[PDB]
């Protein structure tokens, strides 16, 4: 329930939260899997139709939309594989252990593109409670996005407080129109500029991030970056 | 620690409702391209009239419509109502693949009690796997008894090594043989059948390929 809360300790509560999420995830991967077959048949139907009556504006529309669904579903299952490839068990972890590998790899990666990665303040031994892999992925996705869309530089900044950790990621690349700053976290949502880019697919990254982070009782925000591009702010509570 | 009771409450609400919100958002996003897909068939039916193919497209679109709708949110059934569409569609698909599908004995009006969709997917996955891995032929056979229904599926394709016959039902697992040419199919099957107090098994097939046997209990 998580409403296991009538009586229970915080830890027990989250395990009940972990129990629910896994079934929600089983549901999503089972439906994702099962959507593929009628879809397969539909495509055999269009194919057979194109053979009998040839190309059409209408048929072309049906075929491209069927391909959109096909693609989304494929990406949904790729995701499902990864989130269940993660065991979920929530544990106490120090911020530095949790994200140092991620940041070091990002420095290596930034260096290859010829770009620069700068850590304004590194993470310390600050206590968190959660799924280590999930929070790691949250940060690699935010920084990999930054490395990709940046023009020359990336910046990462940690901040600690009696209350929590605040992670800030910045890039000097193109921004995100103010309207889209709310929308970028919706699933399958990409900006017209990344659709013009025409590279990559999926718009799950930030949807996965927002979900994980809310599940970890924190929050995420997209803003104008002082470097001129995009700013991502993660806040997570301390565990005591 | 510093937080207001209100901040606690919102943190808590958002925390429990995030996956729900995620799934309902995924559902919304799949629904819009689908809505367009349905007007393409509609506009096409306007332009070029009825066709078997157009009918096919339309019903498949109505199925997608229903399952995406599930993302947002046991009964008594007769085996024949439960699985005939699964089988008819398996026949449609088989004809296109250039393969042959044979039903040695069809299901009758045999009482079952469970989730119709779960059991449908259970059978559909077993025969559709058989259409995939088969070389030329597939055979489906029903059997009834005072106790239950036993569905047997056979193919003439490559088999599965005896060691792997237990593993293939594990989720996200595929044999190394299949890895040269998702792995939820037989996991979905095992789950639904076990949930209906039945069982699933992989064996040697008389056709030379793989044999899958589903047993489900009858209803009182
Ligand atoms: N650093 C960035 N600068 C500008 N826009 C960005 C940046 N990162 C993301 N966006 C915009 O927000 C969208 C959401 O991206 P998100 O990570 O959710 O999916 P994605 O990066 O497109 O694909 P993937 O799922 O493979 O990461 C992106 O397509 C892009 O349009
Ligand atoms: N009829 C068959 N003949 C031979 N091998 C099979 C047969 N059915 C399943 N297998 C093997 O067992 C594995 C389990 O398949 P399962 O249905 O669980 O996933 P899948 O069919 O590979 O993928 P999907 O989930 O998309 O159907 C397959 O990858 C395949 O190696």
Same fold, A1-87 and A88-240: no
Q: Taking the domains of chain B in order of start, what are their residue ranges?
A: 1-73, 74-220
Residues with Cβ within 8 Å of A1's Cβ and at least 6 positions away in sequence, in order, are A16, A20
What does DSSP say about strands A116-121 and A153-160: parallel, antiparallel, or unpaired?
parallel
Distance of CA B116 to the CA centre of its chain: 11
Could you tell me the CA-to-CA distances from A174 to A150, A153, A192, B5 in Å, in that order?
A: 7, 12, 12, 39
Can you name the CATH fold of A1-87?
Helix Hairpins (1.10.287)
Known active-site residue A33: yes
Could you tell me the CA-to-CA distances from A161 to A88, A118, A121, A235, B201 in Å, in that order?
A: 26, 22, 14, 11, 57
B172: left (phi over 0), alpha (psi -120 to 50) or beta: left
Task: Choose among A76, A62, A198, A111: nearest CA to B22.
Answer: A76
Residues with Cβ within 8 Å of A227's Cβ and at least 6 positions away in sequence, in order, are A153, A155, A170, A171, A172
H helix and E strand count, chain B = 6, 7
Q: Which structure tokens are listed for A231?
A: 């700013």
Q: Which structure tokens are listed for B68?
A: 């995406």
CATH of domain B74-220: 3.30.565.10
Closest chain A residue to B65, measured at CA: A35
Which numbered atom of ligand 1 lies nearest the CA of A206?
18
Q: What is the 3-state secondary structure (H, E, C) of B119-160?
A: HHHHHHHHHHHHHHHCCCEEEEEEEECCCEEEEEEEECCCCC
CA dihedral A18, A19, A25, A30 (to 10 degrees): 170
Residues with Cβ within 8 Å of A178's Cβ and at least 6 positions away in sequence, in order, are A224
Q: Tell me the C-alpha distance between B41 and B43, whole Å.
A: 6
Q: Tell me the C-alpha distance between A24 and B211, whole Å.
A: 32
Q: Tell me the C-alpha distance between A147 and A107, whole Å.
A: 10
Task: Choose among A106, A138, A134, A146: nearest CA to A122.
Answer: A106
Inter-chain contact A238–B25, Cβ cutoff 8 Å? Answer: no
**If you measure from the C-alpha of residue B169 to the centroid of ligand 2, how many angstroms do you get, rounded to a whole number?**
9
CA dihedral A212, A215, A219, A223 (to 10 degrees): 30
What does DSSP say about strands B137-144 and B100-105: parallel, antiparallel, or unpaired?
parallel
CA-based end-to-end distance of chain B: 57
DSSP SS3 for B48: helix
Asked if A188 is an interface residue toward chain B (Cβ–Cβ < 8 A), one would say yes
Q: Which structure tokens are listed for A229?
A: 């591009």
Residue pointed to by tokens 């043989």: B177
8 Å CB contact between A203 and A133: no
Nearest to B40 among A38, A58, A217 (CB): A58
Greatest Cα pair distance in chain A: 70
Nearest to B184 among A33, A37, A66 (CB): A33
Can you name the CATH fold of A88-240?
Heat Shock Protein 90 (3.30.565)
CA dihedral A60, A63, A69, A70 (to 10 degrees): -140
Inter-chain contact B64–A69, Cβ cutoff 8 Å? Answer: yes
Q: Which CATH class is domain B1-73?
A: mainly alpha
**If you measure from the C-alpha of residue A66 to the centroid of ligand 1, how many angstroms do you get, rounded to a whole number?**
24
Q: How distant is the Cα of A117 from the closest Cα of chain B, in angstroms?
A: 32
Helix (H) or strand (E) segment spanning residue A47: helix A10-53
- Whose CA is closest to atom 17 on ligand 2? B185
| Ligand 2 binding residues, C-beta < 6 A | A 33; B 125, 129-130, 133, 155, 157-158, 160, 168, 174-175, 178, 182-187, 209-210
Q: How distant is the Cα of B145 from the closest Cα of chain A, in angstroms?
A: 30
Approach to solving? X-ray
Resolution in A: 3.3
Nearest to B43 among A58, A73, A187 (CB): A58
Q: Mutating which of A25, A29, A43, A58 best tests the B interface, going by the most B Cβ atoms within 10 A?
A: A58
DSSP SS3 for A94: strand
**If you measure from the C-alpha of residue B173 to the centroid of ligand 2, how many angstroms do you get, rounded to a whole number?**
8
**If you measure from the C-alpha of residue B109 to the centroid of ligand 2, how many angstroms do you get, rounded to a whole number?**
30
Task: Choose among A185, A189, A207: nearest CA to B29.
Answer: A189
């Amino acid at each position: 329930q998580e409403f296991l809360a009538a009586g229970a300790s915080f830890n027990q509560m989250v395990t009940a939260l972990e129990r629910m999420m896994t079934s929600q995830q089983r549901l999503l991967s089972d439906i994702s899997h099962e959507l593929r077959t009628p879809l397969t048949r539909l495509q055999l139907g269009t194919a057979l139709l194109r053979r009998r009556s040839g190309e059409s504006k209408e048929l072309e529309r049906i075929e491209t939309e069927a391909q959109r669904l096909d693609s989304m579903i494929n990406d949904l299952l790729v995701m499902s594989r990864n989130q269940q490839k993660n065991a979920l068990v929530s544990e106490t972890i120090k911020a530095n252990q949790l994200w140092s590998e991620v940041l070091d790899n990002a420095a290596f990666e930034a260096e290859q593109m010829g770009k620069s990665l700068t850590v304004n303040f590194p993470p310390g031994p600050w206590p968190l409670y959660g799924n280590p892999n999930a929070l790691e992925s949250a940060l690699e996705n935010i920084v990999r996005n930054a490395l990709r869309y940046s023009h020359t530089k990336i910046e990462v900044g940690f901040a600690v407080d009696k209350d929590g950790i605040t992670i800030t990621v910045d890039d000097d690349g193109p921004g995100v129109s103010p309207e889209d700053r709310e929308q970028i976290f919706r699933p399958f949502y990409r900006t017209d500029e990344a659709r013009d880019r025409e590279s990559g697919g999926t718009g799950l990254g930030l949807a996965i991030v927002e979900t994980a982070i809310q599940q970890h009782r924190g929050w995420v925000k997209a803003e104008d970056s002082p470097l001129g591009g995009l700013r991502l702010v993660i806040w997570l509570p301390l565990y005591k």
